[PDB]
Design a protein around this motif. Structure first.
Motif, mmCIF file in Angstrom:
data_model
loop_
_atom_site.group_PDB
_atom_site.id
_atom_site.type_symbol
_atom_site.label_atom_id
_atom_site.label_comp_id
_atom_site.label_asym_id
_atom_site.label_seq_id
_atom_site.Cartn_x
_atom_site.Cartn_y
_atom_site.Cartn_z
ATOM 1 N N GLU A 85 10.973 4.465 -25.507
ATOM 2 C CA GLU A 85 9.733 4.534 -25.763
ATOM 3 C C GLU A 85 9.526 6.334 -25.957
ATOM 4 O OE1 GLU A 85 6.946 4.987 -26.862
ATOM 5 O OE2 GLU A 85 5.642 6.042 -26.695
ATOM 6 N N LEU A 86 10.637 6.415 -25.153
ATOM 7 C CA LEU A 86 10.497 8.462 -24.481
ATOM 8 C C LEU A 86 11.950 8.850 -25.164
ATOM 9 C CD1 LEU A 86 10.676 10.912 -23.295
ATOM 10 C CD2 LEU A 86 12.197 10.109 -21.402
ATOM 11 N N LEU A 87 13.278 8.170 -25.609
ATOM 12 C CA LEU A 87 13.451 8.312 -26.781
ATOM 13 C C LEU A 87 13.501 8.496 -27.619
ATOM 14 C CD1 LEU A 87 17.267 6.254 -26.305
ATOM 15 C CD2 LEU A 87 16.852 8.672 -26.200
ATOM 16 N N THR A 88 12.299 7.423 -28.311
ATOM 17 C CA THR A 88 11.106 7.615 -29.500
ATOM 18 C C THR A 88 10.820 9.254 -29.620
ATOM 19 O OG1 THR A 88 11.342 5.180 -30.070
ATOM 20 C CG2 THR A 88 9.683 6.256 -31.550
ATOM 21 N N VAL A 89 10.131 8.990 -29.285
ATOM 22 C CA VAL A 89 8.745 10.287 -29.342
ATOM 23 C C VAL A 89 9.631 11.169 -29.032
ATOM 24 C CG1 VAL A 89 7.191 8.925 -28.093
ATOM 25 C CG2 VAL A 89 8.200 10.105 -26.765
ATOM 26 N N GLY A 90 11.112 11.847 -28.831
ATOM 27 C CA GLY A 90 11.597 12.918 -28.528
ATOM 28 C C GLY A 90 12.039 12.890 -29.595
ATOM 29 N N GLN A 91 12.993 11.896 -29.473
ATOM 30 C CA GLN A 91 12.894 11.860 -31.379
ATOM 31 C C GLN A 91 12.783 12.787 -32.379
ATOM 32 O OE1 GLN A 91 16.039 12.397 -34.086
ATOM 33 N NE2 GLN A 91 16.957 12.316 -32.396
ATOM 34 N N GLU A 92 11.688 12.128 -32.165
ATOM 35 C CA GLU A 92 9.992 12.472 -33.248
ATOM 36 C C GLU A 92 9.883 13.733 -32.904
ATOM 37 O OE1 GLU A 92 8.096 7.602 -33.782
ATOM 38 O OE2 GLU A 92 6.780 9.797 -32.423
ATOM 39 N N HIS A 93 9.796 14.547 -31.618
ATOM 40 C CA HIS A 93 9.541 15.742 -31.275
ATOM 41 C C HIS A 93 10.602 17.094 -31.835
ATOM 42 C CE1 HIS A 93 7.779 18.999 -29.554
ATOM 43 N NE2 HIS A 93 9.120 19.522 -29.539
ATOM 44 N N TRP A 94 11.929 16.381 -31.868
ATOM 45 C CA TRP A 94 12.980 16.850 -32.241
ATOM 46 C C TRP A 94 12.320 17.054 -33.490
ATOM 47 C CZ3 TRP A 94 18.170 15.323 -29.099
ATOM 48 C CH2 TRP A 94 19.467 16.185 -29.575
ATOM 49 N N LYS A 95 13.049 16.166 -34.396
ATOM 50 C CA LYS A 95 12.940 16.858 -35.997
ATOM 51 C C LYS A 95 11.563 17.434 -36.227
ATOM 52 C CE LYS A 95 14.160 11.559 -37.180
ATOM 53 N NZ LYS A 95 13.993 10.185 -38.070
ATOM 54 N N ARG A 96 10.478 17.384 -35.399
ATOM 55 C CA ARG A 96 9.226 18.192 -36.032
ATOM 56 C C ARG A 96 10.144 19.546 -35.846
ATOM 57 N NH1 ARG A 96 6.467 13.653 -35.986
ATOM 58 N NH2 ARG A 96 8.134 12.577 -37.654
ATOM 59 N N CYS A 97 10.823 20.291 -34.942
ATOM 60 C CA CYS A 97 10.916 21.036 -33.979
ATOM 61 C C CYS A 97 12.915 21.554 -34.628
ATOM 62 C CB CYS A 97 11.588 21.273 -32.061
ATOM 63 S SG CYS A 97 9.770 20.828 -31.709
ATOM 64 N N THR A 98 13.097 20.903 -35.756
ATOM 65 C CA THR A 98 13.997 21.064 -36.109
ATOM 66 C C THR A 98 13.917 21.082 -37.906
ATOM 67 O OG1 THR A 98 15.552 19.013 -36.872
ATOM 68 C CG2 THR A 98 16.224 21.117 -34.583
ATOM 69 N N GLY A 99 12.858 20.934 -38.161
ATOM 70 C CA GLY A 99 12.212 20.625 -39.967
ATOM 71 C C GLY A 99 11.336 21.894 -39.657
ATOM 72 N N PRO A 100 9.589 21.041 -39.952
ATOM 73 C CA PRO A 100 8.407 21.344 -40.043
ATOM 74 C C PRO A 100 8.424 22.761 -39.668
ATOM 75 C CG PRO A 100 8.522 19.007 -40.203
ATOM 76 C CD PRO A 100 10.108 19.653 -40.112
ATOM 77 N N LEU A 101 8.454 22.380 -37.912
ATOM 78 C CA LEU A 101 7.744 23.607 -37.294
ATOM 79 C C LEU A 101 8.704 25.206 -37.293
ATOM 80 C CD1 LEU A 101 5.618 24.444 -35.558
ATOM 81 C CD2 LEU A 101 7.199 23.594 -34.004
ATOM 82 N N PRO A 102 9.966 24.977 -36.423
ATOM 83 C CA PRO A 102 9.956 26.520 -37.621
ATOM 84 C C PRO A 102 10.040 27.281 -39.101
ATOM 85 C CG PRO A 102 12.071 24.977 -36.732
ATOM 86 C CD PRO A 102 10.781 24.270 -37.222
ATOM 87 N N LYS A 103 10.058 26.051 -39.767
ATOM 88 C CA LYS A 103 9.671 26.784 -41.344
ATOM 89 C C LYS A 103 8.224 26.729 -41.154
ATOM 90 C CE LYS A 103 12.582 23.207 -44.785
ATOM 91 N NZ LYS A 103 12.856 22.786 -43.466
ATOM 92 N N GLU A 104 7.162 26.466 -40.664
ATOM 93 C CA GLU A 104 6.283 27.459 -40.116
ATOM 94 C C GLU A 104 5.884 29.105 -40.106
ATOM 95 O OE1 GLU A 104 3.724 24.624 -38.426
ATOM 96 O OE2 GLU A 104 3.307 23.211 -40.054
ATOM 97 N N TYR A 105 5.912 29.159 -39.531
ATOM 98 C CA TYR A 105 6.689 30.413 -38.534
ATOM 99 C C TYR A 105 7.413 30.947 -38.921
ATOM 100 C CZ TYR A 105 5.332 28.665 -33.836
ATOM 101 O OH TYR A 105 4.763 28.231 -32.279
ATOM 102 N N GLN A 106 8.320 30.526 -40.437
ATOM 103 C CA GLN A 106 9.151 31.720 -41.136
ATOM 104 C C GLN A 106 8.115 32.391 -41.924
ATOM 105 O OE1 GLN A 106 12.291 29.569 -43.050
ATOM 106 N NE2 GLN A 106 13.595 31.582 -43.167
ATOM 107 N N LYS A 107 7.631 31.033 -42.735
ATOM 108 C CA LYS A 107 6.618 30.908 -43.594
ATOM 109 C C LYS A 107 5.515 32.476 -42.784
ATOM 110 C CE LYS A 107 6.613 27.414 -47.077
ATOM 111 N NZ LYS A 107 6.384 26.290 -46.855
ATOM 112 N N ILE A 108 4.916 32.396 -41.977
ATOM 113 C CA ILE A 108 3.718 33.586 -41.229
ATOM 114 C C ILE A 108 4.933 34.234 -41.627
ATOM 115 C CG2 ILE A 108 2.896 34.106 -39.711
ATOM 116 C CD1 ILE A 108 2.615 31.337 -38.690
ATOM 117 N N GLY A 109 5.725 34.607 -40.339
ATOM 118 C CA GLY A 109 6.932 35.493 -40.514
ATOM 119 C C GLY A 109 6.719 36.659 -41.965
ATOM 120 N N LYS A 110 7.192 36.236 -43.036
ATOM 121 C CA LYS A 110 7.320 36.175 -44.305
ATOM 122 C C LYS A 110 5.865 36.543 -44.792
ATOM 123 C CE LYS A 110 11.662 34.424 -45.492
ATOM 124 N NZ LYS A 110 12.887 35.515 -46.271
#
Lengths: 355, 355
Positions: free
Chosen positions: A175-200
Motif C-alpha cells: 500500500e505504502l509503495l503504491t501510494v508513494g509511487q503515485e505521489h512520486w509521479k505527480r511530483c515529477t510530472g504535472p505538479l512541477p509543470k503547474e508551478y512552472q506555468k504559474i511562474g511563466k
C-alpha cells in the motif's frame, strides 16, 4: 558447517559475531590495482576483515543470489537483486544486508565468493557450491538448537503467528509503495509543470505591464518578474525533491517487500512438515512409515521452528531499526524542503515595493 | 451634468474628488432598521457620505450594470457582476470599484440608486434613467476637456497604443487565470488525496508493526502513527489553502478580465469615429455631408481621445496598485502556508525515538 541456534531474551535467535562484518562495493577502475576494462562491468568488493579485493560482474551476484536461495531459502529470506550509479548503490545495500546476516555471512559459499585468490579458485568454489546437497529442507539437518525440542502445539502457534504478521505486513508495505509511487509521479510530472506555468504566466504579465512604457513601474514589474522566476525555481525544486527523501522511503519498502515475498514458500514448507508430523501416527499405524522415521520428522519440525523464530527475531530487530531510521530521514528532508520553499518565497516577497 | 477632463502629469485625466467615496454592502437582517424578510434576498447599502441606507435585490444591481453600460459603455469599462457569502463579497468589490470611479460615482443614475427615500422615488429615478438619451456615443457630448483639440495623428497613435496594451494584457490575464485554475483543481482534488493516502498508509503500517504484540516498540509505532496523522492534517491544509491566497489572485485577475472585455467595443467605436473623420474631406467634397457636420465629427473625435486617455490613466493607476497588493498578499500567505507545513513535520519528527 553446523549452525547454532540459542534462546535469548526474545526466544530463539542466531549466534551473532562479536564484531560486525561488512563489504565495500566499488568501481575497480578507481582502485589501487592495475585494472583492464571490459564489458562486462565489474564491481570491486573489499570485505571489512581484509585488505584483499575481488572483482565480480553482475551475473556473479545473480549466481550467488540463486545459490543462497537454493541452499538457505527454506529458512531465510534472500533480498531481491536490483542509472548505473543506482545499481551500485543497490548492490552495496544487498551485500551489506547479507554480510550482516549471521548465517549467510558464515556460509562457505558466501565466504569463497568474497575471498578467492585466482580465477582457478573461483571456478572451483563455484562448482562446489553448485553441487552442495545440503539445500532446501536438508538445510535444517545442519542446524542445532541449544534447547529442548519444542512440542507441536507451540510449533504450530509460532508458525501461524509468523504467517499472519508477514501477510499483514506485505499488504501494508505494498500500500505504502503504491501510494508513494503515485505521489512520486505527480511530483515529477504535472505538479512541477503547474508551478512552472504559474511562474511563466507572472513573467508574461510583468512583460505586458512593462509595455506601458511608463518608467515609474519598473521596480514593481521587476519584482513580479522575479517572483515568476522564483516559481520556476520552485518547480525544479519540487521535481528534484523525491530523489532526496521519498526515494529512500521507497527503497526501504522495496527491500522489505523483497524479504516478505520469500515467506509464502518458507511458511508453506513449514506448514507442510507440520502436517506430515500430524499424519505420522496414522502413517505408522498403517505401516506406511517406520517409527524411527516419525522420530526424525518430529525432530526436524522442532529445528525448523527454532530456525523460523530465530530468523523472525533477525527480521524484527532489523525492521524496527530500519523503519525508524528511514522515516526519520524522510521527515528531516521534508522539513528542509518546505523551509527552503518558504525562504525562496520570503525572498521574492522582500523585493516588492510597498504601496 | 458636464464631465470635466483635465491634463495632468500623465496627460488627460478625470477630476478626482477631494475625499474618497465608498459604500458598505451589508445584510439588512443585521441592520438597525426593522426589516421584513423575503425571497428575494436584498443587500443593504450605506454610502460613506450619509447614515441613510437603501436595500436592493440582486436584480437591481443587474439593472444598474445595464444602465451604466448603456450610458457610459462607449468610454468607460463597467466591471462584470458576480456560496451566498461569496456573492456579497463580490458585490462589495463591484460597488467599491464604481464608487471610486470619478465619473460613474457622480452620475445621476448611480447617486439616485443609492439615495432614494421611498419606493415611489426609486421607481421614478428608475424610469428617468431608462429614458436617458445621453448614452452610447452621445455621452461624449457631455464631456469637456480643458485643453486644446487634439490632432488626428496623436488621436490615432493614442488609440492604437491602448488597443495594443489591452489586447496583450487580456492574453496575459487569461493565461494566469487558466493555469491558476488548473493548479487550484489539483490542490483541492488529487493532491490532498495523495497526502491523505500516504498518511493512512503510514498508520496502517504502524498498526501492523503493533501486531507484533511486542511492547518494546510502542513509542516507535506511536510516532509513525502520529506522522501518518500529520500527513492527513497536511492534506486538509493543502485542500483549504487556495481559499486563502490563490482565490484573491484569481479574483483580481477575473475583475481585470472583466474590464478588458469592454475594450473591443470601446476601441471599435473609437476607431470607427476616426475612420469617419478620415473620410470627412471626401464626404464633404462629394456633397454627402456639410462643412459644419465635419466640424462636429472632428471636435467629437478629440473629446473621445481625451476621454480614452483619461480612463486609461484611471485604469493604469488602479492596475499598478491592485497587482502590487494582490501579489504581495498571495506571497505572504504562501510563505505562511509553507512555514506551517514545515512546523507540522518538525513536530512529527520530534516524537521519534532516536536509535
Amino acid at each position: 558447517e553446523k549452525i547454532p541456534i540459542i534462546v535469548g531474551d526474545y526466544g530463539p535467535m542466531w549466534v551473532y559475531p562479536t564484531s560486525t562484518f561488512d563489504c565495500v562495493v566499488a568501481d575497480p577502475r578507481k582502485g589501487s590495482k592495475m585494472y583492464g576494462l571490459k564489458s562486462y562491468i565489474e564491481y570491486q568488493l573489499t570485505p571489512t576483515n581484509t585488505n584483499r579485493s575481488v572483482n565480480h560482474r553482475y551475473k556473479h551476484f545473480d549466481w550467488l543470489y540463486e545459490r543462497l536461495l537454493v541452499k538457505f531459502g527454506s529458512a531465510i529470506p534472500i533480498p531481491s537483486l536490483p542509472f548505473i550509479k543506482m545499481r551500485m548503490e543497490r548492490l552495496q545495500a544487498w551485500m551489506t544486508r547479507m554480510c550482516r546476516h549471521p548465517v549467510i555471512s558464515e556460509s562457505e559459499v558466501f565466504q569463497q565468493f568474497l575471498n578467492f585468490r585466482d580465477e582457478k579458485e573461483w571456478k572451483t568454489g563455484k562448482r562446489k557450491a553448485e553441487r552442495d546437497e545440503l539445500a532446501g529442507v536438508m538445510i535444517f539437518s545442519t542446524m542445532e538448537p541449544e534447547a529442548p525440542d519444542l512440542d507441536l502445539v507451540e510449533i504450530e502457534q509460532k508458525c501461524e503467528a509468523v504467517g499472519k504478521f508477514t501477510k499483514a505486513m506485505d499488504d501494508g508495505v505494498k500500500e505504502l509503495l503504491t501510494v508513494g509511487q503515485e505521489h512520486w509521479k505527480r511530483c515529477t510530472g504535472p505538479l512541477p509543470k503547474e508551478y512552472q506555468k504559474i511562474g511563466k504566466a507572472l513573467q508574461s504579465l510583468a512583460t505586458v505591464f512593462s509595455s506601458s512604457g511608463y518608467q515609474g513601474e519598473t521596480d514593481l514589474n521587476d519584482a513580479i518578474t522575479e517572483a515568476g522566476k522564483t516559481y520556476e525555481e520552485i518547480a525544479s525544486l519540487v521535481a528534484e525533491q523525491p530523489k532526496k527523501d521519498l526515494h529512500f522511503l521507497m527503497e526501504c519498502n522495496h527491500e522489505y517487500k523483497g524479504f516478505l515475498g520469500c515467506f509464502p514458500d518458507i511458511i508453506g514448507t513449514h506448514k507442510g512438515a507440520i502436517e506430515k508430523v500430524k499424519e505420522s501416527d496414522k502413517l505408522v499405524a498403517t505401516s506406511k512409515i517406520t517409527l524411527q522415521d516419525k522420530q526424525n520428522m518430529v525432530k526436524r519440525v522442532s529445528i525448523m521452528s527454532y530456525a523460523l523464530q530465530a530468523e523472525m527475531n533477525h527480521f524484527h530487530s532489523n525492521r524496527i531499526y530500519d523503519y525508524n531510521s528511514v522515516i526519520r530521514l524522510y521527515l528531516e528532508q521534508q522539513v528542509q524542503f518546505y523551509e527552503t520553499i518558504a525562504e525562496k518565497l520570503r525572498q521574492a516577497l522582500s523585493r516588492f515595493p510597498v504601496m
